């Protein structure tokens, strides 16, 4: 189906294969999911193309491990994933993403700016 | 000066709301929908019917802004019924150089022709 | 320099007067009718059959001015019979800027191919 | 700068000489025939089958000059059989001003693909 | 300034790998295959099915480089099944002078979408 | 159906709904219709797009409450409605429309001029 | 059928109607036909568009009353009629047409010149 | 089928007819074939378009009588035939073609150069 943002609470074996490609450094299910530790993923034609982890603390929210598969970058996937994360957590009024793991901090900043985040020491904020 | 034919824009999975042999010409489309996909009044459009498999070409006329109407009119009403799910596309031509950086206007619909998303690119299908 | 394909003109609901496999090529049209819709001798035209649903493309030739003839000739005569009600259209290409203000040549027919009305625009379909 | 689509040339009532699903691409035409109708190797052509009514589009390749071959090849061989009588046409685009004085290249065939006549105009059909 | 429509490139006898009504749009093609035939993401393409005879037009999207995927998606999946052998073509327009010396990008496939040969010309069919 | 001018002698419930949109200020059937007080309406695809009231006094005729729905203006509807009113009351040799209720007297004058009426104090005349 | 030159030895009622239009000044069958007084006619889609009378005297041959219907002039009909007359009377080595009845001697001379006749006093000759 | 390079070990009657056209100077089967004297041929739509003789002596290999049918030259056939000969005799590290029989030594040298052969006295070499 068309590009869709989903919250993954349980993982199929396809999901497991896809998440290994998106996140080679992590071993599912080292990945914990509960009500405050979320994983959102972009799904397109029964495959995941991008993922991010979300940590909620009421009005504060942290983002880490945002990654879009190299093959499908600059097609708006990253942006749609993040907007759906913001939109579906309307309780959060302050978001943080630390610059950890980021390949290319220059690209990340231009992306986070398009989405309205301000660059700060160690990260990006929208708050 | 080789000229390519490029997808200009599409309405993805709208529902036919009216179909009548006795109406004039030949697909009437809510104004807002035309704007979202960059489609013009009197422009040639192709219609692909997901419900019944038929593929046909016609031209677009305006329907009242906000009506949500997809009206398949005249001879075309042999090719679609009320409630069919269709994709509506138009195509433009441009030099090869411009074609390599072209981004189509794409609009996504759910339920009763509710526009869910506009975008400028289709993701890459992965294995 | 994006180029659009626009409805140039149409003959709305003419009646086929002759159809014969043995005639040469491929839709002969009363001269007056061609002029009314801005259609040229040897121009590509699309024919949509309201009576039987068939949609096919051919090219126009002239028939004697004032004869009222719509003659569907050669291979095309597999697609229409004497008395069928058809719509005949042609399409032209022009830059997007011109396309936004384009007005098609439209001609309306009743009874025995009596031209009732010419116009330069199709109204908006309302709810 | 409105651009028209005009019949460029046609081969009128040639006989299919070969048809085979296993051949490559997609209509091979005697060289002399292509020249007579101004049709180019690799050009898009439309084929209208008078024998069975099918209308399809493909592209032309050369067959050996003087062979008289009309070979309908690959997927197209679903649309025609050996001995079918077909019309082969191509279309070009040009400004409206040139279109009003355009004369197509027309070639007429009888018997075993014997070229009987070339001409530059189709007569007017009279009552 | 007469403009011809020329075969730009083709994928000759690829195998459909996926077909699904529920996928988005409308033929996803391995990246490497698009490059080999000079076909662009979002370009209009024609698909000719050798297995079942169907001929339809759509537009191309990218699939992951090296996947070998030919995915026939959405409404088009009414026109082809998994394992069908198809030819995929695109067409461009250029002035007559350039058309007389044009060479198409052609790619040949065998077995499980293994690219066997690229070339710039189709031979002449001999008697 | 195509754009048609009709004299309304009886009103359906669709007619009532349509006339409320065309004339929010009037309450059907406050609207009296007899042989000398007429209402003509423009009908397009089973809806009314414009209306006008006609008062006849033999060789003199008055027009009031001419209105075309905002959504479908400048598509020739107003002009066709008025021509059909003039044409179908060939006994009237002198017509008057008072400038009462008119939103934009500047637009009205340019319209009434296109139709051959002269601007006068308090109105337009053709006589 | 396509444009064909025929020798008329017997006349149908269609032929009689057609010849009255081509030759209003003559009353069929005032028209005598035998082996030396011939009438050749151009036929297109079961109608005659042009006619000429031929008088043979062995190696000498006279032409009179050459006329093409006004509606279909300058489409090559006149030229094809004359070539078929010359070609099918290969015994005649000297042809004459007198300038009698000719509307526009200027047009006639340019035509007879295209066909290789020389202008002479009272006529044209090819000999 | 598409253009294919084949090693001919036995000859059909079609092969015999084709080889006479490619090689009028030789009389099949004057032509000896064993494990060290080979004939490779280019086949396209069940006909041979080009042939060459190959003599193997372990790491040394001789080529003679390379000819492509005149009608189908400059379409890449000659080049593909030679590449398939080289590729399918990967034991040979030194190839020679003598300039015997060659029509146009100038054309031959440009061809053999495209394929990476060096011109030498009496021939071409790649070694
Ligand atoms: C274990 C771990 O995962 S640690 C975390 C590691 N993550 C990373 O290293 C990030 C690697 N990079 C990525 O994943 C992607 O490149 C992302 C998320 C930065 C961007 O995702 P995309 O889907 O490619 O971006 P998208 O196309 O949605 O971009 C939207 C906007 O961002 C901006 N943008 C994105 N990429 C770029 C770029 N390369 N240069 C400039 N601007 C850019 C543009 O404004 C763009 O809008 P446009 O296409 O209209 O110009
Ligand atoms: C209770 C009551 O109803 S009180 C009466 C209230 N009525 C009003 O206030 C009138 C409101 N306006 C309207 O209803 C419409 O704008 C009308 C009747 C003036 C015009 O109807 P339309 O259907 O829009 O006009 P139409 O397209 O037929 O115009 C024909 C010609 O009029 C002229 N015209 C119309 N609108 C304009 C304009 N806005 N500017 C310049 N010329 C115009 C043009 O010559 C036009 O021909 P073109 O399109 O070839 O240039
Ligand atoms: C009782 C009786 O019938 S009395 C005899 C009366 N007959 C007449 O008065 C003749 C009236 N005129 C005619 O019938 C026609 O105009 C004819 C026979 C002169 C010409 O017939 P057509 O079918 O129109 O001519 P056709 O198109 O075959 O012309 C061939 C060539 O003739 C020349 N030609 C024809 N008409 C013209 C013209 N009007 N001006 C210049 N050249 C012309 C051109 O070279 C043309 O070739 P082109 O189109 O490649 O330029
Ligand atoms: C008994 C006997 O048979 S004796 C042997 C007799 N043989 C001969 O006399 C050879 C006659 N000539 C031929 O058969 C052909 O012309 C050949 C074999 C030289 C070439 O075969 P083709 O299939 O025509 O060549 P092909 O199209 O594969 O050429 C590949 C490259 O060769 C070069 N080439 C081929 N022909 C030419 C030419 N006429 N001029 C310049 N370069 C050429 C070009 O680089 C070309 O690539 P391009 O089309 O990308 O420019
Ligand atoms: Mg992306
Ligand atoms: Mg209007
Ligand atoms: Mg003529
Ligand atoms: Mg070649």
Residue numbers in the entry:
A (entry chain B), F (entry chain B), G (entry chain B), H (entry chain B): 1 to 127
B (entry chain A), C (entry chain A), D (entry chain A), E (entry chain A): 0 to 126
Tell me, in the authors' exact words, what the paper reports.
To confirm that the observed PanD(T57V) conformation when in complex with PanZ is solely caused by the protein-protein interaction rather than as a result of the site-directed mutation, we determined the structure of a second non-activatable mutant, PanD(S25A), in complex with PanZ.AcCoA. Diffraction data were collected at room temperature in-house to 2.1-Å resolution. The overall architecture and major protein-protein interactions were completely consistent between the two complexes (PanD(S25A)-PanZ and PanD(T57V)-PanZ). However, owing to the change in the available hydrogen-bonding interactions, slightly different conformations of the active-site loop were seen. Nevertheless, in both structures one of the two residues at the site of cleavage adopted a Ramachandran-disallowed conformation (Ramachandran et al., 1963), suggesting that the PanD activation region is forced into an unfavored and, therefore, high-energy conformation upon binding of PanZ. This destabilization may lower the energy barrier for activation of PanD to ADC. In the two uncleavable PanD site-directed mutants used in this study, the unfavorable nature of this adopted conformation is reflected by the formally disallowed peptide backbone angles observed for either PanD-Gly24 or Ser25. For both proteins, global fitting with a 1:1 binding model (Houtman et al., 2007) yielded robust estimates for dissociation constants of 35 ± 4 nM for the PanD(T57V)-PanZ.AcCoA interaction and 157 ± 5 nM for the PanD(S25A)-PanZ.AcCoA interaction.
We have recently described an additional component in the pantothenate biosynthetic pathway, PanZ, which promotes the activation of the zymogen, PanD, to form aspartate α-decarboxylase (ADC) in a CoA-dependent manner. PanD (encoded by panD) is post-translationally modified to form its catalytically active form, ADC, by cleavage of the peptide backbone between residues Gly24 and Ser25, leading to the formation of a pyruvoyl cofactor from Ser25. The PanD-PanZ protein complex is a cross-shaped heterooctamer, with one PanZ molecule bound to each of the PanD protomer-protomer interfaces. In addition, we show that PanZ acts as a CoA-dependent inhibitor of ADC catalysis.
